[PDB]
């Protein structure tokens, strides 16, 4: 997270820190969010060989008595995730067990498929990702308040796809999600409306977030 | 380390685990070895923006009683280290503090400048690097027994420069130091004869270690 603040420990109890081993045996991180006692949402680009999910954390370098460390049974990738347009960057993780729902480890609400988030809202993104374009990932959870943009802010001024994707972040501040933040939530009035997906190599706003609203029907179909 | 075993915990008190922030804000590892209370030996390729040395470790993901975490003040890379021949791949770390010498944290002898290692000596290499070509780095120290080769084994069968470099490992075994083991000791007869420098991308033996003997007169002029 670029430009933001240290979170209050345990105040975002849905937050999932992902330890991923990639196919070529690289340890990589991603974020994610707990939406049921068994399912973590994250970004399909956070695919690996093996994933361990750490829940209940603040500082993942420390062996905090709230933490719950579970392995992933399944990685369920959106069946239309192309890996060039970056489109449909959403994945469900099935956990090996159910979590114990506790004050420090609990679920986040998802929208209704009718809920769309407007341009001009100010939302919160959180993660253990890089705090700079050349600064390393964070061992403690960080947070940043970001503004939902118009489609014009990412289209004719870049890239996109609006039904599926949110355009987030005003080029008037270096506030961003970055590397290692991926698959983290975007919260808007406490609801998971976005997933950190991608942006500019230089972290310059705006960035692209998957639009949770759209995929709620996919999410329910797989989970149920 | 590929094809080795866990070490017995704390049994190699010279061993340093290096935690490196690269100039692009990436966290990498290397190995290294304690030669005096203020200086650690390692590879020149293990250069970074910022180096944290952990002594007294076995499992670097636990906060073990024996550990001393110290920052590096200076990185002194050999004055003729090029970055194509990969020659002169040796670096001194000047520590911020002097270390406290304990049962778990103490120094390894250096050869005398007249002490060459022969072809056919049996030596030990230790590290926290990858345990296979596609397998992740190791959280606990591993070690492997390696066989010092004749020049022929790395020249007409590949690469080399004999005065400054050792060929290590028979093509009879897949035993190897790999990614993350860089900058670790090659122990022959009590004494640190080698530093893990480089090899083949398949990690197929033989590999190349810096010949410590040759660099002693440099080491003493820098430290002393």
Swiss-Prot record, chains A, B:
Keywords linked to the UniProt accession: Disulfide bond, Hydrolase, Protease, Serine protease, Signal, Zymogen
GO biological process, one term: proteolysis
Gene3D superfamilies assigned: Trypsin-like serine proteases
SMART domains to which the protein is assigned, alphabetical: Tryp_SPc
Cross-referenced InterPro entries: Peptidase_S1_PA (IPR009003), Peptidase_S1_PA_chymotrypsin (IPR043504), Peptidase_S1A (IPR001314), Trypsin_dom (IPR001254), TRYPSIN_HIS (IPR018114), TRYPSIN_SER (IPR033116)
Active site: 45, 89, 182
PROSITE patterns xrefs: TRYPSIN_DOM, TRYPSIN_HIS, TRYPSIN_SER
Peptidase S1 domain residues: 1-224
EC number: 3.4.21.-
Family note: Belongs to the peptidase S1 family. Granzyme subfamily.
Function: This enzyme, isolated from small intestine, specifically inactivates the apo forms of a certain group of intracellular pyridoxal phosphate-requiring enzymes. It has chymotrypsin-like specificity towards small substrates.
Protein name (record): Mast cell protease 2
Species whose genome carries this gene: Rattus norvegicus (Rat)
């Amino acid at each position: 997270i670029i430009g933001g603040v240290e979170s209050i420990p345990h105040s975002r109890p849905y937050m999932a820190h992902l330890d991923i081993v990639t196919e070529k045996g690289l340890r990589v991180i991603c974020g994610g969010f707990l939406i049921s006692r068994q399912f973590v949402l994250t970004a399909a680009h956070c695919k690996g060989r093996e994933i361990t999910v750490i829940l209940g954390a603040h500082d993942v370098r420390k062996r905090e008595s709230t933490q719950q460390k579970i392995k992933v049974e399944k990685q369920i990738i959106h069946e239309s995730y192309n890996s060039v347009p970056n489109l449909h960057d959403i994945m469900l993780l099935k956990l090996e067990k159910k979590v114990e729902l506790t004050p420090a480890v609990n679920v986040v609400p998802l929208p209704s498929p009718s809920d769309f988030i407007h341009p001009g809202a100010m939302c919160w993104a959180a993660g253990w990702g890089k705090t700079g374009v050349r600064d390393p990932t964070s061992y403690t959870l960080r947070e940043v308040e970001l503004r939902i943009m118009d489609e014009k802010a990412c289209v004719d001024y870049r890239y996109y796809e609006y039904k599926f994707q949110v355009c987030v972040g005003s080029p008037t501040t270096l506030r961003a999600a970055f590397m290692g933040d991926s698959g983290g939530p975007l919260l808007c009035a406490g609801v998971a409306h976005g997933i950190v997906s991608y942006g500019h190599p230089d972290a310059k706003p705006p960035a692209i977030f998957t639009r949770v609203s759209t995929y709620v029907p996919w999410i329910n179909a797989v989970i149920n």
